[PDB]
């Protein structure tokens, strides 16, 4: 069907202007809809921004009273939001979001983008292995983990075994002190398999371009 | 604008259970060609809202056919005839009839269900975290329900709650529980000076809290 996918930068000056981007594929954007955009706050309260539609027609919400401009290229089958005069109150998630213009269906919506207005500096995180204590591995099941510290912004990706091991995984949401995240991840394998099989924590921090790939270590003879 | 009113704020129903919410709009959402632009979303943990009702009363693009969605003029309800724990989530309505156009504050699905002890596992700070001079210890609290849970700390037998730092996970829809991160955050200095470091979880499931420890220096 129609897929959308935002692109653009995740962190903003104060001041500044957000600019994002949306991809169509599988559809033509001079055909049918209006695309939308709409962010979520922290809060989780839904805000529809504006739409520009098939035609090239467009409309935007008040509350942004002239801070946006909603655009397209038809030649690469994208549209675009600019939102000048920032401040922390944008920090959001952004999504662009297909609806027909004729009966409101078949709602499509990218993954979403966050956006953070802030003055704080791109951080990388630092990824230390969480290897269980050794009184608790003689069990049926062992859960190892893995704690990133100190990056900003968000976010990071966090995978296990690059992804092949999914089940038994809970990433927990970051958790934000003095302008650096930590978030942790923790992983339950049955305990016959470890250290036999190995377990890895593969992090990604798009905004300072790192990647870490911390192999868990028992404690004890390595 | 158009106020979007959500009832209720949040509903807990049993799997195989039915489930009804409302929307009611300030100003009715009929338009003058016979059309009533009101649509229900469904937003599951970490994605994206997902279609599932438009013009009041039509089934979205491929949704399933539990949801059925009634109403008109301004009262509005969303009705799952049998729900399904990867129906948890928060369900929005919105309006595209007057400009601007609004959404409800939404209203969150949670799954109740038997409940279940956390699986407490503690962790000691890593060695390559202790020669940057910091030191977190970290506890999980994993797969209980319900979602109201106790953990305070210890250092040699003595609770410790500054630089405590705690984040929850939403309701998993594999099986409808609940997890937690607890993590306790000093300099190294402070952890190199005491042996013992514990975790201990209250839980309604227990009249005894759940209790991991381990000592600085051993396995």
């Known amino acids: 069907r129609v897929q959308l996918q935002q692109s653009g930068p995740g962190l903003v000056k104060p001041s500044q202007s957000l600019s994002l981007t949306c991809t169509v594929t599988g559809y033509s954007i001079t055909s049918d809809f209006a695309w939308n955009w709409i962010r979520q706050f922290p809060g989780n309260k839904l805000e529809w921004m504006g739409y520009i539609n098939y035609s090239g027609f467009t409309s935007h919400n008040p509350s942004l009273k002239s801070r946006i401009s909603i655009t397209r290229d038809t030649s690469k089958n994208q549209f675009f939001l600019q939102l000048n005069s920032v401040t922390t109150e944008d920090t959001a998630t952004y999504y662009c979001?297909?609806?027909?213009?004729?009966?409101?269906?078949?709602?499509?919506w990218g993954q979403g983008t966050l956006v953070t207005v802030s003055a704080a500096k791109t951080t990388a995180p630092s990824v230390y292995p969480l290897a269980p204590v050794c009184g608790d591995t003689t069990g049926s099941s062992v859960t190892l983990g893995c704690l990133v510290k100190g990056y900003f912004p968000e976010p990071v990706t966090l995978t296990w075994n690059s992804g092949s091991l999914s089940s038994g995984v809970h990433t927990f949401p970051a958790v934000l002190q003095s302008d650096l995240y930590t978030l942790s991840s923790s992983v339950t394998v049955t305990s016959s398999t470890w250290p036999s099989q190995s377990i890895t924590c593969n992090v990604a921090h798009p905004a300072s371009s790192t990647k870490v790939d911390k192999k868990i270590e028992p404690r004890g003879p390595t | 604008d158009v106020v979007m009113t959500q009832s209720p704020k949040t509903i807990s129903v049993t799997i195989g259970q039915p489930a009804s919410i409302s929307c009611k709009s300030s100003?009715?959402?009929?338009?003058?060609?016979?059309?009533?632009?009101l649509n229900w979303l469904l937003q599951r943990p970490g994605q994206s809202p997902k279609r599932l009702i438009y013009?009041?009363?039509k089934l979205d693009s491929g949704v399933p056919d539990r949801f059925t969605g009634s109403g008109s003029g301004t009262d509005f309800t969303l009705k799952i005839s049998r729900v399904e724990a990867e129906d948890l989530g928060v369900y929005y309505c919105?309006?595209?009839?007057?400009?601007?156009?609004?959404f409800g504050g939404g209203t969150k699905l949670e799954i109740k269900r038997a409940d279940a002890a956390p699986t407490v596992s503690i962790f000691p700070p890593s060695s390559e975290q202790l020669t940057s001079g910091g030191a977190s210890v970290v506890c999980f609290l994993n797969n209980f329900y319900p979602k109201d849970i106790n953990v305070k700390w210890k250092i040699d037998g003595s609770e410790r709650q500054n630089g405590v730092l705690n984040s929850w996970t939403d309701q998993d829809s594999k099986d409808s529980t609940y997890s937690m991160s607890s993590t306790l955050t000093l300099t190294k200095d402070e952890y190199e000076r005491h042996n013992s470091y514990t975790c201990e979880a209250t839980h309604k499931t227990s009249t005894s809290p759940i209790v991991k420890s381990f000592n600085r220096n051993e396995c």
């Open positions: 979001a297909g609806l027909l213009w004729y009966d409101g269906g078949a709602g499509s």
């Open positions: 919105w309006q595209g009839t007057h400009f601007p156009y609004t």
């Open positions: 013009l009041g009363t």
């Open positions: 100003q009715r959402l009929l338009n003058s060609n016979g059309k009533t632009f």
